[PDB]
Amino acid sequence: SAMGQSTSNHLWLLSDILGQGATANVFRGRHKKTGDLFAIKVFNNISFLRPVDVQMREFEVLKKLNHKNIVKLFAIEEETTTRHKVLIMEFCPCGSLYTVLEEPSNAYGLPESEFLIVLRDVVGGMNHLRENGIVHRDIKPGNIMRVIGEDGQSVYKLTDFGAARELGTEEYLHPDMYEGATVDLWSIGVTFYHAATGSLPFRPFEGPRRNKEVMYKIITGKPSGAISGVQKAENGPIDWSGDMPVSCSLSRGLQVLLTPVLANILEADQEKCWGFDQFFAETSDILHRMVIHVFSLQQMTAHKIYIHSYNTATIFHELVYKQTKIISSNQELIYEGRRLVLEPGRLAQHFPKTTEENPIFVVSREPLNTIGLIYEKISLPKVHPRYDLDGDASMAKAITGVVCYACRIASTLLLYQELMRKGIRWLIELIKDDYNETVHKKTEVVITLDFCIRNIEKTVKVYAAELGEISDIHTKLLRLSSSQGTIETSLQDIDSRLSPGGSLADAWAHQEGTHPKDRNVEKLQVLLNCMTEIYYQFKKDKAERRLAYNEEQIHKFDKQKLYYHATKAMTHFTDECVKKYEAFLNKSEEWIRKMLHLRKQLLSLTNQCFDIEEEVSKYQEYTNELQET
Amino acid sequence: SAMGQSTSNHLWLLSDILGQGATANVFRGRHKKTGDLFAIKVFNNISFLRPVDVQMREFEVLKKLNHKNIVKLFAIEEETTTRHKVLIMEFCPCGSLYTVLEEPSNAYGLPESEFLIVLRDVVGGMNHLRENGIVHRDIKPGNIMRVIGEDGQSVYKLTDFGAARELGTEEYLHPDMYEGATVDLWSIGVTFYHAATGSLPFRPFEGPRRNKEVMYKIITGKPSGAISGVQKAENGPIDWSGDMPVSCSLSRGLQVLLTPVLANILEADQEKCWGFDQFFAETSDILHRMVIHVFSLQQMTAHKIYIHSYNTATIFHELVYKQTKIISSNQELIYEGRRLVLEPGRLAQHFPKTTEENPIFVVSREPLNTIGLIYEKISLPKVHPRYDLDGDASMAKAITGVVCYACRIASTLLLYQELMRKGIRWLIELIKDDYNETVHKKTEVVITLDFCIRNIEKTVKVYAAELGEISDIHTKLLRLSSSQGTIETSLQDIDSRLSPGGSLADAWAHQEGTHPKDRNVEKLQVLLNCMTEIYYQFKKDKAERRLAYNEEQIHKFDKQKLYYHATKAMTHFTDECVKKYEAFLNKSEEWIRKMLHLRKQLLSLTNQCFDIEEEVSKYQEYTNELQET
Ligand SMILES: C[C@H](c1ccnc(Nc2nc3cc(-c4cnn(CC5CC5)c4)ccc3[nH]2)c1)N1CCN(C(=O)CC(F)(F)F)CC1
Ligand SMILES: C[C@H](c1ccnc(Nc2nc3cc(-c4cnn(CC5CC5)c4)ccc3[nH]2)c1)N1CCN(C(=O)CC(F)(F)F)CC1
C-alpha cells in the first residue's frame, strides 16, 4: 500500500501484482484520469538488450489487433522515473484457464458447457492470429485469460504471442522441441486434453522433477493413436490409452468427436500429423453441431446427440444407435408425455426442444440390459499428521476434488432416477392408451359380428342343402366369437396389471430411490463449501511460507476437520445416495422385463383383433352378396 | 491483530467484534484446546450492578435450553485479568435476519421459500420459550440469527431474551409501550411484515428522526384492520392499506393467508387482538399446508394453491376459483401433456408433483381476459454529484435493489412466456386429439349408415303403400347423410386451422417473445454483480468514515459507474424484455380468442355426431324389427 510506480496516464501499486515472468512483471493498475482498470506489464532486468527502433515497431503490429479472443494491448507508454517502457493491456478480472482448473470442482475436467467455450475461443483466437501472420507455439492454460462476457458466459483470450522472436512451457513441448506450422498444435492438444480431463496427458511417477528423463520417451513413444501415457509405479510401465478417462465429465457424444482431434494432433511424424487447416476444419464441425438430449429409458442412460442442424432424421437415428445400440427401425420415441414420430427427411433444426431435465426418451420392442450410470469409484486420498504447507495445499485440492466428483455423481444419479420416474410414468399411461384403443377396435368387430349372427338367424326366419350351408356359415361365424370371447377376457388381465395396485404399478419409483426432497445433493455441497474454503486458505498459507503459532494450530485443526467433512460426506454418498440408487436401479430392471412382456402380449391381442376384423367384413359379404335376375 | 482478551478455555481478538449493545459486546472467539468458534459476550461497564447469586442463577436456566431455533449458550466463564463474566454461545456464521434484509436482493421482500423458513423458525422457537416460562417481547430482525443447516436450508435462532429483568427496539414497539402475553406479537408482526415487504409497516416522512412524533399516532391509529401506514409528503397524510404491496414477491396464495395473521396481531385494543394460543394455532395452519402450482394458461398467470394434504379435491377447485375466478365445473386441467381429471374425494397428498417450472395448467370453456404478469413499475432513484459516505451507501442499496426487482420481473416474465409456450403446445395437440377422436365416431355412423341405405335397396331387390313407406325410410335415412356430408366437410376446416401453417398455429410463440437463448436474465445479473460489489464497498466505506484522496476519487468513479450500469440494465429491461413480453402477450390474446372459437365449433360438430349416431341405431331397427308368425 506504500510503494508503486506510475506513467504519464496510468499508475499502479507494487503489491498489486498479477503476473510473473523473466522479461516482465504484470500489475493491476488504473488509468489516472478515469480510474479504469488495466493490466500493466513492467519490464525489469531489461537494460542489456533494448533496441529502440525494432521493439517499438513490432508493438504497433499488436496495437491495432482487435478480436473477441485476443487480449487487447491498448497503449505503449514509458515509466516516469525508471524510463522503462510499460504496456497497457486489458485487465481480465477472472484470471486464466490455469486458475480455472485449479478449482477442485475441475479436478476431473471442466463442465461440458465450459469446455466448449474453451475450444471455441482458443481455436477462434488462434486462427485469427495466424491469418494476420503472428504465431504462438506456446498455448498453455496459464497464457489463456478469461473474462465474463455481457451474457454471463466466459470469453477466453490469449496473450504471450510473438515474444520468442525477442528472446515455452516444459509440460507442453513436442518430440523434437524438448532438448513448424504444426508444432503449435501439440501444446494445443495438451491443453484441450487438460481442460477435458482435469490432469495432463503424459506423466511419469515422480513427474516433471529431476526425474523428468522418463517424460521424453513417453512423449516420443507415439504409440498407435494414443492420447495419454501414465506410469503409476516407480521405474515402472507406461500405460497407454487412446480414450478419455471415466472421471471425465464429458458426454459420450462429444468424446467420440474430440478423441480423433486430440489423437491426430498428438503425434510426432510431421507428415502423419494434422495441420491448422485440417485442424481448424475439424474443430469447426464440432462447434457447429447442435445437441439433442436423448434419455435411453430402457437402459437408464442419458446421451447427447451431437448432430448438425442440417442433418436428416435418418442420420439422427444412426447417431443414437452408435450410443444406445438400438436399431433405427426399433428406436421409439416419447416427448412431453406423447409418442414422438420422426419422418426421415426432417432436418435437425426442426426437432423439438431438449435439455438434460427434459429430453427425448427412447424405448424399444427388443430387450436391453440396463447399465445404469457408469462412473469412476474414487476413494479419498491420504491425510497425514505431517505439518507441511505445500503438501497440505496440494492435498486440500485433491481431497476436495474427489468430493466434488462424489457430489457430481450424486446429482446425476438423481437426474437419472427422476428421469426414469418421469419416463416410466408416461410409458404406463401410453401403454394404457393401447389397451383402451383396442377396446374400440374390438367393439367395431364384436357388435357388428354379434349383430350379423342375429341376421343369419333373421334370414332363416323369413323367406335342404342350402339350409345346411347356412348353419355352416352360422357356426364358423360363431367360431369367430369363440376366439373373440377369449381375447376380450385375456385383455382384462392387462387391465389389472396396468390399473393401480397391479403388476405394472410404478408405485416403487416413488418409494425406492432418492428424491429432490431428500436434499442429498444440497446436503453434500454444505460440507463441500467447508472443505473448499479450507482449501483456499491452505492455498493462501502456501504463499505465506511461514506461520504464527496461533495460525499454525488453526491450520492443524482445520486440516483435521477437512478429513472429517470428507469422510462424513463420503459415507453419505455411498451408504445413502449410491445404495438407494442401486436399489431403485435393480427394481427398475424387473419392471422393464415385466413391462416388455405386456408390450408383446397386448400387441398380439391387437394383431389378432385385426384378423377377426378382416374375417367379419369378408363374411358379412357371403350371402349378403349373392345374385339373381 | 495485536490485542484481545482470554478466559480459562476460550480466547478472542478485539478487532474480531461481531455485536454491540449497552450491557455487553459480542466477539468472534475460539476455544483454546479445540480451535472451535463460538460467540463471546463480554460485559463492559458492568461494575455498578453485578449481583453474584442472582445473575449466575438465571444463566443456569438458559444453560440447558436446547432447541433448533434457540441460540444455545454453552458455558458461563470468567475473564482472566478483568474478572468479567463471559458467555460462550453458538457462533451463527451467517449473521442475523437484519443482515439478510440489507442485501439489495431483499429490498422488496424475502423470497417466498426463505420467508416461510423465517415464519416457521421464529414461531417455533418462541413457542418453545413460552412453554418454559421465558419471554422476549422484543423479537427484532437483528436479534434473530441464522445458520445454514445440514441440508443447506437456513435455520433461524433467537437470542436476547430475558434481559429486561436485569435492566426494546424503537421501531418495533406497541401503542402503549411507546412513551402482557400479547404485546410480544406486535414486534412479531412488524418483523413478519418487514421480511415479506422489504420495508417496515409504519413510517413518517422524516422517519424515526427528531421528527418521530408523527409515528406515535400512526401506530395508535389502528384503522379498520390495516397493516401499514405511510405518509409520503412532509406534514402530509397517512395512507393506509390492509394488504401487501405489489413489489411484494410473495404468491397471492400466501398473501391471502398471511394478511389476516398480521392484521389481527397489529392492533391496539387488547381484547380485540390475538393471543399466542390463537396466533400459534393460525400460523401452524399456514406451515402445515402443501403448495400446488397452478398455471392459469387462459389468463397467463401463475398461482400457488396453499392446500392441506388432507383436503379434498372439491376444496382445491374452490381454492383455485378464489385466485383464477374460474368455476369448479368449468375448471379444466392439463398435466405433463395430458388432460388431468380429478375426482372430488381425492386427497391433496395424492395429486401429481408440481413446480413453478412444471405446474398444473388450467383451461376453461368460458372466456377470460388475460391480465398477464402484474408487477410494480419502479423507476431508478436519484444519483447526486454530492460526495457523501452515508448517503452513497444508502443510495447504493436502493438503486441496486430496484435492479434486482427488474431482474426478478425479467425472469418471471420469461417463466410465464415459456410456460405459455409449453401449455399452448400441448393444448393444440390435445384439441387435435378431439378432431381425430371424432373421425372414428363418424365412421361408426357413416359406414353403418351408408351400408344401411344399401340394405333398404337390397330389401326391395329381393322378396303399393308399403313400397311408399320404404322410400320414406329411404329418403329420411339419406337425409341423415345430408347433414353428415356437411359435418365431414366443415370438420376439414378445423383440419386446416389445426394443421401446420393454419389459423391456430403456435408459430408465433416461438418467434414473438424472449427466450432462454436470449440470455436476458443472465445479461442483467452481470451488471447486477457490478452494482452489488460497489454497494458492499460503499457499505465498507461507510464504516471507515474518512477516506484517502486516491480512494476518494475511486468511490467517485465507481458511484458514477453504478448509475451507468443501472441505466444500462434498465434500458435493456424495458426496451427489450418488457416490450417483447408485451408483444408476445398481445399476440397470445388473439390465439386464445381464436382457439376458444374452435373449441365451441369442434364440440357442436361432435355433439351432432352423437345425434345422428342415435338416429341410425334407432332406424336400423324399424323394418329390421318387424314381425309375423
Ligand atoms: C484472481 C484475479 C486474477 C488473477 C490473475 N490474473 C488476473 N488478471 C489478469 N492477469 C493478466 C495477465 C495478463 C498478461 C498479459 N501478458 N502477460 C504476460 C506475463 C504473465 C507472463 C500477462 C494480462 C491481463 C491479465 N489479467 C486476475 N484477481 C484479480 C484482482 N486481484 C488483484 O488484483 C490482486 C492484487 F491486488 F494483488 F493485485 C485479485 C483477484
Ligand atoms: C457476517 C458474519 C456475521 C455478522 C454478524 N454476526 C455474526 N454472527 C453472530 N452474531 C452473533 C450474535 C450473537 C449474540 C448473542 N447475543 N447477542 C446480544 C448482543 C448483540 C447485542 C448477540 C450470538 C451469535 C452470533 N453470531 C456473523 N461475519 C462472521 C465472521 N466474521 C467476523 O468474525 C468479522 C470479524 F472478524 F470482524 F470478527 C465476518 C463475517
XYZ file of N, CA and C in Angstrom, chain B residues 453-606:
462
model
N -78.481 -47.905 -46.090
C -79.269 -47.475 -47.241
C -79.120 -48.469 -48.388
N -77.951 -49.110 -48.511
C -77.804 -50.201 -49.469
C -78.690 -51.384 -49.092
N -78.908 -51.597 -47.790
C -79.709 -52.726 -47.332
C -81.197 -52.502 -47.575
N -81.666 -51.255 -47.475
C -83.057 -50.957 -47.802
C -83.283 -51.064 -49.307
N -82.255 -50.782 -50.112
C -82.330 -51.070 -51.541
C -82.189 -52.564 -51.809
N -81.448 -53.275 -50.951
C -81.339 -54.726 -51.039
C -82.618 -55.423 -50.596
N -83.453 -54.750 -49.797
C -84.724 -55.320 -49.368
C -85.762 -55.268 -50.485
N -85.833 -54.151 -51.218
C -86.769 -54.067 -52.332
C -86.286 -54.863 -53.541
N -85.005 -55.246 -53.577
C -84.489 -56.056 -54.677
C -84.935 -57.511 -54.555
N -84.980 -58.048 -53.334
C -85.425 -59.421 -53.115
C -86.918 -59.426 -52.801
N -87.428 -60.568 -52.340
C -88.844 -60.724 -51.998
C -89.745 -60.251 -53.136
N -97.728 -49.589 -54.381
C -98.149 -50.177 -53.115
C -97.820 -49.234 -51.963
N -98.687 -49.206 -50.948
C -98.482 -48.295 -49.828
C -97.213 -48.636 -49.057
N -96.888 -49.929 -48.935
C -95.698 -50.332 -48.191
C -94.413 -50.065 -48.972
N -94.469 -50.095 -50.307
C -93.335 -49.622 -51.096
C -93.148 -48.117 -50.919
N -94.250 -47.373 -50.774
C -94.164 -45.955 -50.474
C -93.673 -45.656 -49.074
N -93.828 -46.606 -48.148
C -93.245 -46.479 -46.817
C -91.741 -46.729 -46.853
N -91.301 -47.665 -47.700
C -89.876 -47.961 -47.837
C -89.121 -46.721 -48.299
N -89.579 -46.105 -49.391
C -88.918 -44.914 -49.907
C -88.929 -43.769 -48.904
N -89.883 -43.757 -47.968
C -89.905 -42.713 -46.946
C -88.819 -42.947 -45.903
N -88.643 -44.199 -45.478
C -87.493 -44.550 -44.649
C -86.205 -44.298 -45.419
N -86.208 -44.607 -46.716
C -85.011 -44.459 -47.537
C -84.584 -43.000 -47.644
N -85.530 -42.096 -47.914
C -85.169 -40.692 -48.098
C -84.713 -40.062 -46.787
N -85.457 -40.293 -45.702
C -85.052 -39.747 -44.411
C -83.798 -40.429 -43.878
N -83.527 -41.670 -44.299
C -82.244 -42.297 -43.996
C -81.123 -41.703 -44.841
N -81.453 -41.152 -46.007
C -80.498 -40.372 -46.781
C -80.480 -38.910 -46.358
N -81.509 -38.454 -45.632
C -81.493 -37.119 -45.046
C -80.544 -37.036 -43.856
N -80.266 -38.165 -43.195
C -79.183 -38.199 -42.221
C -77.845 -37.957 -42.904
N -77.635 -38.576 -44.069
C -76.377 -38.408 -44.787
C -76.210 -37.003 -45.347
N -77.289 -36.222 -45.435
C -77.176 -34.856 -45.938
C -76.480 -33.956 -44.922
N -76.914 -34.008 -43.659
C -76.190 -33.316 -42.600
C -74.873 -34.009 -42.275
N -74.741 -35.290 -42.630
C -73.477 -35.996 -42.452
C -72.441 -35.532 -43.466
N -72.872 -35.219 -44.688
C -71.944 -34.704 -45.679
C -71.389 -33.343 -45.308
N -72.229 -32.479 -44.727
C -71.757 -31.165 -44.303
C -70.814 -31.278 -43.111
N -71.125 -32.176 -42.175
C -70.334 -32.296 -40.956
C -68.932 -32.802 -41.273
N -68.815 -33.752 -42.200
C -67.500 -34.261 -42.574
C -66.647 -33.172 -43.214
N -67.272 -32.270 -43.975
C -66.511 -31.280 -44.728
C -66.136 -30.075 -43.868
N -67.069 -29.580 -43.047
C -66.753 -28.500 -42.119
C -65.827 -28.955 -40.997
N -65.640 -30.269 -40.832
C -64.593 -30.770 -39.950
C -63.216 -30.551 -40.566
N -63.106 -30.691 -41.891
C -61.840 -30.490 -42.589
C -61.414 -29.028 -42.614
N -62.306 -28.113 -42.239
C -61.922 -26.725 -41.994
C -61.099 -26.618 -40.716
N -61.495 -27.361 -39.679
C -60.705 -27.457 -38.455
C -59.383 -28.169 -38.721
N -59.361 -29.113 -39.663
C -58.111 -29.769 -40.036
C -57.077 -28.756 -40.502
N -57.500 -27.776 -41.304
C -56.571 -26.768 -41.803
C -56.099 -25.852 -40.679
N -57.040 -25.319 -39.894
C -56.674 -24.428 -38.797
C -55.676 -25.095 -37.858
N -55.899 -26.370 -37.534
C -55.023 -27.080 -36.612
C -53.706 -27.480 -37.269
N -53.741 -27.876 -38.539
C -52.547 -28.421 -39.166
C -51.550 -27.305 -39.481
N -50.233 -27.605 -39.391
C -49.204 -26.573 -39.589
C -49.452 -25.580 -40.712
N -49.212 -24.303 -40.418
C -49.479 -23.229 -41.343
C -50.870 -22.655 -41.243
N -51.746 -23.278 -40.463
C -53.131 -22.882 -40.401
C -53.369 -21.704 -39.478
N -54.649 -21.511 -39.158
C -55.086 -20.364 -38.374
C -54.777 -20.498 -36.890
N -54.591 -21.715 -36.379
C -54.287 -21.924 -34.966
C -52.853 -22.417 -34.759
N -51.935 -21.947 -35.597
C -50.530 -22.306 -35.460
C -49.922 -21.627 -34.238
N -49.102 -22.372 -33.498
C -48.307 -21.804 -32.420
C -47.008 -21.216 -32.932
N -46.929 -20.961 -34.241
C -45.697 -20.474 -34.846
C -45.199 -19.224 -34.142
N -46.129 -18.386 -33.685
C -45.785 -17.106 -33.083
C -45.108 -17.283 -31.729
N -45.597 -18.220 -30.906
C -44.997 -18.438 -29.593
C -43.482 -18.476 -29.698
N -42.976 -19.123 -30.754
C -41.555 -19.320 -30.970
C -40.844 -18.099 -31.530
N -41.567 -17.154 -32.138
C -40.900 -16.034 -32.790
C -41.500 -14.677 -32.428
N -42.083 -14.522 -31.244
C -42.506 -13.178 -30.859
C -41.913 -12.694 -29.542
N -41.726 -13.567 -28.554
C -41.253 -13.165 -27.242
C -39.756 -13.349 -27.055
N -39.329 -13.301 -25.790
C -37.946 -13.537 -25.402
C -37.766 -14.977 -24.929
N -36.543 -15.472 -25.031
C -36.251 -16.881 -24.812
C -35.055 -17.096 -23.899
N -34.898 -18.309 -23.362
C -33.705 -18.601 -22.550
C -32.415 -18.507 -23.340
N -32.474 -18.643 -24.669
C -31.300 -18.429 -25.504
C -30.948 -16.953 -25.597
N -31.943 -16.074 -25.468
C -31.681 -14.639 -25.463
C -30.773 -14.250 -24.301
N -30.788 -15.035 -23.223
C -29.899 -14.824 -22.078
C -30.051 -13.418 -21.507
N -31.288 -12.928 -21.469
C -31.526 -11.581 -20.972
C -31.510 -11.511 -19.452
N -31.876 -12.589 -18.755
C -31.781 -12.566 -17.300
C -30.335 -12.749 -16.867
N -29.589 -13.589 -17.596
C -28.154 -13.709 -17.379
C -27.447 -12.396 -17.673
N -27.817 -11.748 -18.781
C -27.242 -10.459 -19.148
C -27.368 -9.444 -18.018
N -28.558 -9.343 -17.420
C -28.776 -8.350 -16.372
C -27.922 -8.651 -15.149
N -27.962 -9.901 -14.676
C -27.238 -10.279 -13.468
C -25.767 -9.907 -13.546
N -25.194 -9.913 -14.750
C -23.820 -9.447 -14.928
C -23.681 -8.031 -14.386
N -24.490 -7.105 -14.910
C -24.465 -5.731 -14.420
C -24.874 -5.654 -12.959
N -25.775 -6.535 -12.531
C -26.210 -6.557 -11.139
C -25.047 -6.828 -10.202
N -24.149 -7.737 -10.590
C -22.990 -8.045 -9.761
C -22.040 -6.858 -9.682
N -21.799 -6.192 -10.813
C -21.027 -4.955 -10.798
C -21.593 -3.979 -9.779
N -22.905 -3.764 -9.817
C -23.545 -2.825 -8.905
C -23.462 -3.295 -7.461
N -23.625 -4.591 -7.222
C -23.704 -5.076 -5.848
C -22.340 -5.054 -5.177
N -21.278 -5.364 -5.928
C -19.936 -5.281 -5.361
C -19.612 -3.847 -4.963
N -20.040 -2.875 -5.772
C -19.888 -1.476 -5.390
C -20.664 -1.189 -4.112
N -21.880 -1.726 -3.991
C -22.691 -1.454 -2.806
C -21.981 -1.894 -1.537
N -21.370 -3.078 -1.555
C -20.714 -3.578 -0.353
C -19.456 -2.775 -0.041
N -18.725 -2.348 -1.074
C -17.604 -1.440 -0.852
C -18.090 -0.110 -0.286
N -19.210 0.415 -0.795
C -19.762 1.644 -0.234
C -20.284 1.419 1.172
N -20.728 0.197 1.466
C -21.071 -0.171 2.835
C -19.831 -0.174 3.714
N -18.727 -0.745 3.212
C -17.474 -0.730 3.961
C -16.936 0.690 4.112
N -17.039 1.505 3.056
C -16.553 2.879 3.133
C -17.355 3.693 4.134
N -18.628 3.353 4.323
C -19.405 3.983 5.381
C -18.739 3.779 6.733
N -18.194 2.581 6.966
C -17.598 2.265 8.258
C -16.290 3.023 8.482
N -15.499 3.237 7.423
C -14.213 3.919 7.575
C -14.388 5.373 8.010
N -15.468 6.017 7.560
C -15.831 7.408 7.838
C -14.922 8.446 7.173
N -13.605 8.255 7.138
C -12.731 9.123 6.341
C -11.978 8.299 5.300
N -11.572 8.959 4.201
C -11.020 8.278 3.031
C -9.836 9.043 2.444
N -8.862 8.294 1.905
C -7.686 8.884 1.270
C -8.060 9.531 -0.061
N -7.187 10.409 -0.565
C -7.526 11.076 -1.817
C -7.679 10.056 -2.932
N -6.761 9.091 -3.018
C -6.861 8.109 -4.092
C -8.158 7.318 -3.973
N -8.480 6.833 -2.772
C -9.755 6.142 -2.599
C -10.927 7.079 -2.871
N -10.826 8.342 -2.446
C -11.928 9.278 -2.660
C -12.306 9.326 -4.133
N -11.306 9.459 -5.003
C -11.555 9.513 -6.440
C -12.144 8.209 -6.942
N -11.693 7.088 -6.378
C -12.239 5.785 -6.735
C -13.747 5.778 -6.511
N -14.157 5.979 -5.263
C -15.567 5.976 -4.875
C -16.367 7.034 -5.616
N -15.712 8.020 -6.227
C -16.393 8.955 -7.117
C -16.493 8.438 -8.549
N -15.516 7.649 -9.020
C -15.674 7.000 -10.318
C -16.668 5.847 -10.224
N -16.544 5.028 -9.172
C -17.368 3.832 -9.040
C -18.838 4.187 -8.858
N -19.132 5.258 -8.112
C -20.520 5.685 -7.963
C -21.107 6.114 -9.303
N -20.323 6.830 -10.107
C -20.774 7.226 -11.436
C -21.030 6.007 -12.313
N -20.212 4.958 -12.165
C -20.428 3.721 -12.911
C -21.625 2.940 -12.374
N -21.947 3.105 -11.088
C -23.119 2.449 -10.510
C -24.407 2.956 -11.139
N -24.411 4.187 -11.640
C -25.571 4.684 -12.372
C -25.583 4.151 -13.796
N -24.423 4.141 -14.459
C -24.360 3.693 -15.847
C -24.770 2.232 -15.973
N -24.279 1.373 -15.077
C -24.778 0.005 -15.030
C -26.289 -0.005 -14.861
N -26.788 0.747 -13.872
C -28.211 0.730 -13.560
C -29.051 1.149 -14.763
N -28.726 2.287 -15.376
C -29.489 2.716 -16.543
C -29.230 1.820 -17.746
N -28.024 1.258 -17.877
C -27.775 0.307 -18.959
C -28.673 -0.910 -18.820
N -28.717 -1.484 -17.614
C -29.578 -2.631 -17.367
C -31.050 -2.258 -17.510
N -31.417 -1.036 -17.120
C -32.825 -0.649 -17.138
C -33.337 -0.514 -18.565
N -32.596 0.187 -19.422
C -32.990 0.247 -20.823
C -33.203 -1.155 -21.373
N -32.317 -2.094 -21.026
C -32.465 -3.445 -21.548
C -33.706 -4.123 -20.990
N -34.032 -3.874 -19.722
C -35.223 -4.489 -19.148
C -36.481 -4.047 -19.891
N -36.674 -2.739 -20.043
C -37.907 -2.255 -20.656
C -37.863 -2.396 -22.172
N -36.879 -1.790 -22.817
C -36.838 -1.758 -24.275
C -36.555 -3.115 -24.910
N -36.315 -4.175 -24.134
C -36.114 -5.495 -24.722
C -36.977 -6.544 -24.028
N -36.798 -6.718 -22.715
C -37.523 -7.766 -22.002
C -39.013 -7.460 -21.945
N -39.373 -6.303 -21.384
C -40.782 -5.940 -21.229
C -41.463 -5.866 -22.588
N -40.922 -5.046 -23.491
C -41.574 -4.816 -24.777
C -41.887 -6.127 -25.485
N -40.887 -7.003 -25.611
C -41.088 -8.266 -26.306
C -41.964 -9.233 -25.525
N -42.109 -9.029 -24.210
C -43.116 -9.761 -23.458
C -44.507 -9.239 -23.770
N -44.637 -7.917 -23.876
C -45.921 -7.316 -24.216
C -46.366 -7.774 -25.590
N -45.422 -7.824 -26.532
C -45.704 -8.271 -27.889
C -46.182 -9.712 -27.914
N -45.538 -10.582 -27.131
C -45.975 -11.969 -27.027
C -47.327 -12.064 -26.340
N -47.547 -11.240 -25.313
C -48.805 -11.274 -24.578
C -49.965 -10.864 -25.464
N -49.794 -9.762 -26.206
C -50.862 -9.269 -27.070
C -51.207 -10.293 -28.134
N -50.189 -10.920 -28.723
C -50.410 -11.956 -29.721
C -51.086 -13.172 -29.108
N -50.780 -13.481 -27.850
C -51.444 -14.578 -27.160
C -52.936 -14.326 -27.029
N -53.321 -13.073 -26.756
C -54.731 -12.728 -26.629
C -55.528 -13.202 -27.833
N -54.958 -13.058 -29.032
C -55.681 -13.394 -30.255
C -55.817 -14.901 -30.420
N -54.754 -15.649 -30.122
C -54.809 -17.100 -30.243
C -55.826 -17.703 -29.292
N -55.995 -17.114 -28.108
C -56.974 -17.642 -27.165
C -58.389 -17.380 -27.669
N -58.664 -16.156 -28.137
C -59.977 -15.892 -28.723
C -60.203 -16.773 -29.945
N -59.164 -16.964 -30.762
C -59.285 -17.816 -31.941
C -59.430 -19.284 -31.561
N -58.691 -19.738 -30.544
C -58.761 -21.145 -30.166
C -60.070 -21.461 -29.455
N -60.577 -20.533 -28.639
C -61.832 -20.795 -27.940
C -62.963 -21.026 -28.939
N -63.006 -20.219 -30.003
C -63.969 -20.424 -31.081
C -63.928 -21.863 -31.586
N -62.746 -22.336 -31.977
C -62.598 -23.714 -32.430
C -63.129 -24.704 -31.404
N -62.922 -24.431 -30.119
C -63.319 -25.391 -29.092
C -64.826 -25.414 -28.867
N -65.558 -24.393 -29.321
C -67.014 -24.479 -29.341
C -67.545 -24.980 -30.681
N -66.784 -24.813 -31.767
C -67.195 -25.373 -33.051
C -66.996 -26.881 -33.068
N -65.775 -27.337 -32.773
C -65.488 -28.767 -32.770
C -66.426 -29.531 -31.843
N -66.861 -28.914 -30.741
C -67.780 -29.602 -29.840
C -69.136 -29.802 -30.504
N -69.714 -28.730 -31.052
C -71.000 -28.848 -31.725
C -70.969 -29.986 -32.736
N -70.017 -29.930 -33.667
C -69.786 -30.998 -34.630
C -69.857 -32.374 -33.977
N -69.282 -32.505 -32.778
C -69.293 -33.779 -32.064
C -70.636 -34.017 -31.382
